[PDB]
Amino acid sequence: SMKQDSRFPNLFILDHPLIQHKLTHMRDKDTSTRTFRELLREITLLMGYEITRNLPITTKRVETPLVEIDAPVIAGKKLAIVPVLRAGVGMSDGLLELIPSARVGHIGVYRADDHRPVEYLVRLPDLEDRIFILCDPMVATGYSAAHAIDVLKRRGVPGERLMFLALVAAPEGVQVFQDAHPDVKLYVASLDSHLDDHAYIVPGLGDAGDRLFG
């Protein structure tokens, strides 16, 4: 299920034993770049599963080998998964595995530590009546997540239709993000403790890029 920190009204910590367990193996610096990629997919599928408990259902006539029925379906086409380049791509794999019918978008943001112009790629589906789920493993300073969301907010889509998916966040990041977008939900596997002098999340996972790509 779900867990919340007093400072952060829109942060949710998904603390299922198996998310937690799989997270630790990612945390472990002995874990290979292979297994690290898998766990990335795996956790995020699980997280996608918690977030989607309340998806509306409709029906559709389907023929089973025995009978025609009105069988329950979701409107998967109404969702857009938007990995943040480059480390978010492994996450969207897991969500795309969960909900294959979804639209995929992509956002390219340069890693800045303040509010300058940073965007280098935006590729998005049609915006009409559509929920957007962004993902990036790390929310360290919270600037990259803010800017990524900023892209959708510039295009007129409001907080209520936006979500951000992460693995690990630092409280200083969740705070920056919250200030910029208080109405956008942020889902997280763990709210870690602090940032170091080099802006790495502690205890964190180390440098995401290095562990995904060597």
Added chain:
Amino acid sequence: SMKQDSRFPNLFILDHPLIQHKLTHMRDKDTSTRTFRELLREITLLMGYEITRNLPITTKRVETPLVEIDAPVIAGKKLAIVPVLRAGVGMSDGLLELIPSARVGHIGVYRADDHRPVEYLVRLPDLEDRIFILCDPMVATGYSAAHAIDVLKRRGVPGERLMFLALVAAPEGVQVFQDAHPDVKLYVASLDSHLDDHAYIVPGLGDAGDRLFG
């Protein structure tokens, strides 16, 4: 989360939107064999996740690239996944993705078609302090399922430590099941409505062996 039927105190129906959705695509007789197989694996992964919400968590020592910590893990070894042959192997695979470190056992009973449990193959991990999770897509008559559980009971393991996982069950099958084993939790994606003359579940999925194997 989970529904229940007034008739069956130890049957749980996992009705998360994406479980229902994915089940529908399996119900559909036009779904290719490629996809039918993947959906078997997927749904049971999700079903596993619901049923493992209450797993005990302890801590291993682990060093991240940054720091050494006491990180949450699970006792995965204390679990036995047991596909009922032949069709249960697909389900086994999804659970194994979820919990890789678990022991795998096998129960073959095509077989005990009606009269008694007839074991063609029973291969099991050690019993001491172990929870067993049996897998089979269909609980039609209930006899296959009850016999599969008999195998374990007749070797000393109490209901308390046994679970059966299926995709679809008929009410007559669940009755037969629970009369033999009132204390064994049976987990299902759907309780369909009835058996036809050939003892197939309606609306159900068809002949599972056929759709998984041609």
Added chain:
Amino acid sequence: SMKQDSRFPNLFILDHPLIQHKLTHMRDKDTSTRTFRELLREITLLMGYEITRNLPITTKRVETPLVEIDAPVIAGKKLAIVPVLRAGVGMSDGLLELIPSARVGHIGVYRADDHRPVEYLVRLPDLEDRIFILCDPMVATGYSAAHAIDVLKRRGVPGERLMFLALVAAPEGVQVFQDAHPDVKLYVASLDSHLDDHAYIVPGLGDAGDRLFG
């Protein structure tokens, strides 16, 4: 590509660098039961790829988003993958991943070290104009492979339409197999050196069952 031993006219050793490399990681006793399952799938997909270079092609009208064409296809329905229970199932996964349209069969054989009756499960598709590919990771004594093939030979299908897929074989096994079925091709990742006092392949992979199932 392919390699051959002078003693064995119908044995083929598939010695691609990546098959070989992936084999070593399986050989390694430090390798987990998880990774061991994956590599099992992976090698056998690769092996399936070498075996199938000469599959006949036909055509089929297909519409691309631009044009209708006569596009190349295989008759995947004409092949049957037949894992030998229980350890062969992971292999058929890889072949089924490669050629999803294939029929799946299953053969249950008891591990004997001589020519007694051993068969406990036979489940097969229609035999008409159909090639059968059996698989089991280990060919130690060669009795299990012989008997498994014996099942198809009893049903009238000749050597020319049969194939056996293995990971590792011992020369004493390849010999027993050859004596019983000289016309049946046997594909192998490595022809290891000898059997030990306990009939384990040396250097081999250890006990297949233990490493797949803990």
Added chain:
Amino acid sequence: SMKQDSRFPNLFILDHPLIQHKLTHMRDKDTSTRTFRELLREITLLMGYEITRNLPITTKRVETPLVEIDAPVIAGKKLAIVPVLRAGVGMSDGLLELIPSARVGHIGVYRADDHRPVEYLVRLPDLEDRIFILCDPMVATGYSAAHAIDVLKRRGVPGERLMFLALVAAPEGVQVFQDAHPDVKLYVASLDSHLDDHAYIVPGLGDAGDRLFG
């Protein structure tokens, strides 16, 4: 194995039956998005296997459950897989399954649409003694592909150590490609026939971005 076209001395067409077969299912406009994605990943895994036939093999020390040996392995670290963003990420995934231990780099150029190579993102492993394998489904005009390779050339790496992998290429695209880079091996599943007015490959696959991403 591999075909060649008289016009193109460094283009190789991988025409294994299952590569052709799987390509056809991608060509088909009725193939669901779920399946289209998996087939991208699959085909490139197979294409990788053909192109890695000649990999050097050395030996690590390894102990099997039975004995200690000198077992064949590969120098996987000496390889860089570089998806060309955005569509190349699917291909990257298949190669990574094949060779998990390889370094991943990224080249973003939607982009250098015509006039020059315009790098929106270039992230690369270290160059010293490294073979680079670029990935992109389509070589239509040839400009994307030539620019992606320019990126690496302009940073010092010779043709000798560069390869490009695509699903489908137009002859005009290959000409453009080889004029810029006569010494770079380009690997393809098919050389289709021509470009239409909108610069799409005929018969080709359609808009790849669209079919991968909705």
